[PDB]
């Protein structure tokens, strides 16, 4: 099944210096039951379809892997508080179109927030605080119909907050690289 290969590829591609994914085994190859592996929640108890991956604070490093496209039934991805780096892949919403919650906070992700984030049409929560993200916040984030939570604090973001995102509070944008506009202080004043 595709979901078993998702987890196999994720384990093979991430760097795992503390062996936190050691308990993940695949004794029946592609047909292994993976619903009791640490960090994994399945839709139901009759299939290997994964609804959420919670791999937070596992000392994982490397880049966010393409293997996640094989976890296509995924709605919640929490990779927060690890040592992941590289950029937020611009393909992420084509890999995981059904994401409701995306939490990549507390890592070392650089580059900018890709404009293709808009393709995650069902996103309720986008949590990207405490990374090394740079550039402007793309105004595409305003077009996420269901976005109720946005956390971009503690990055290196710059320029003007898109006026549509002013519904969110100041705590959501604070600690950035001269980022300005409501809800933060006015640009240059």
């Amino acid at each position: 099944e595709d979901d078993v290969l998702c987890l196999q590829g994720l384990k093979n591609s991430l760097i795992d210096p503390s062996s936190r994914l050691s308990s993940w085994s695949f004794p029946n190859s592609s047909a292994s039951s993976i619903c009791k592996l640490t960090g994994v929640s399945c839709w139901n108890e009759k299939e290997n379809r994964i609804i959420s991956l919670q791999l937070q604070s596992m000392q994982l490093a490397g880049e966010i892997p393409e293997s996640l496209k094989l976890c296509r039934s995924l709605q919640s991805l929490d990779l927060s508080g690890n040592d992941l780096s590289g950029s937020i892949p611009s393909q992420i919403c084509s890999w995981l179109p059904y994401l409701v919650t995306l939490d990549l906070s507390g890592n070392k992700l650089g580059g900018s927030i890709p404009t293709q984030i808009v393709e995650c049409k069902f996103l309720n929560a986008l949590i990207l605080s405490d990374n090394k993200l740079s550039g402007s916040i793309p105004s595409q984030l305003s077009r996420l119909d269901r976005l109720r939570r946005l956390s971009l604090a503690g990055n290196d973001l710059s320029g003007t907050i898109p006026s549509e995102l002013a519904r969110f509070g100041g705590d959501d944008f604070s600690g950035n690289n001269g980022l300005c506009g409501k809800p933060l202080s006015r640009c240059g004043a």
Partner: protein
């Protein structure tokens, strides 16, 4: 004992080739010693765990008398008939798992009264008619799967249904709405 009677009624309406209900002896004081039934400390039923049991037959409305029921696991059997409306009386229910069966008929509107419900998985059945709008009032709902049924009409996106995506609703008869491919007339 009313809870024991309700479960004996259910046994009478189930077809049990592997005799998984053999221990369900009606003459006992309660059903708390019966295999696949869990009681709490006060001898009241909190679980019925009858997945993968090769059961056929139909449910009975007396299940709604199990007032402290938390888990109703009847998934992966061949149970036919409707989902009884009386299941909406089970207000302590956190998991209602009737998936992979041959249930027909509508989703009862009374399931909107299950205000503590976290798991509602009725997928892989032959349920018809509309998704009741009262299901959006269940704010504790974490996992919803109604896929692989014969449901039709508009799919809500408000209340708890903000958390749900086309995965929850796929392969139905004629659902429409922004969450689906097709918009409604």
């Amino acid at each position: 004992n009313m809870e024991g009677d309700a479960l004996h009624s259910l046994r009478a309406n189930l077809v049990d080739p592997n005799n998984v209900l053999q221990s369900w002896d009606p003459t006992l004081v309660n059903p708390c010693t019966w295999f696949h039934v869990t009681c709490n400390n006060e001898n009241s039923v909190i679980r019925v765990d009858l997945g993968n049991a090769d059961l056929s037959g139909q449910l009975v409305p007396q299940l709604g008398q199990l007032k402290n029921l938390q888990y109703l696991e009847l998934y992966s059997n061949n149970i036919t008939g409707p989902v009884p409306s009386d299941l909406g009386n089970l207000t302590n229910l956190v998991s209602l798992d009737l998936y992979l069966n041959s249930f027909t008929g509508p989703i009862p509107d009374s399931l909107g009264k299950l205000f503590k419900l976290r798991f509602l998985r009725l997928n892989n059945n032959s349920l018809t008619g509309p998704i009741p709008m009262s299901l959006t009032n269940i704010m504790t709902l974490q996992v919803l799967d109604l896929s692989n049924n014969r449901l039709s009409g508009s799919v809500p996106d408000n209340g708890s249904f903000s958390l749900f995506t086309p995965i929850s609703f796929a392969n139905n008869l004629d659902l429409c709405g922004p969450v689906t491919s097709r918009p409604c007339p």
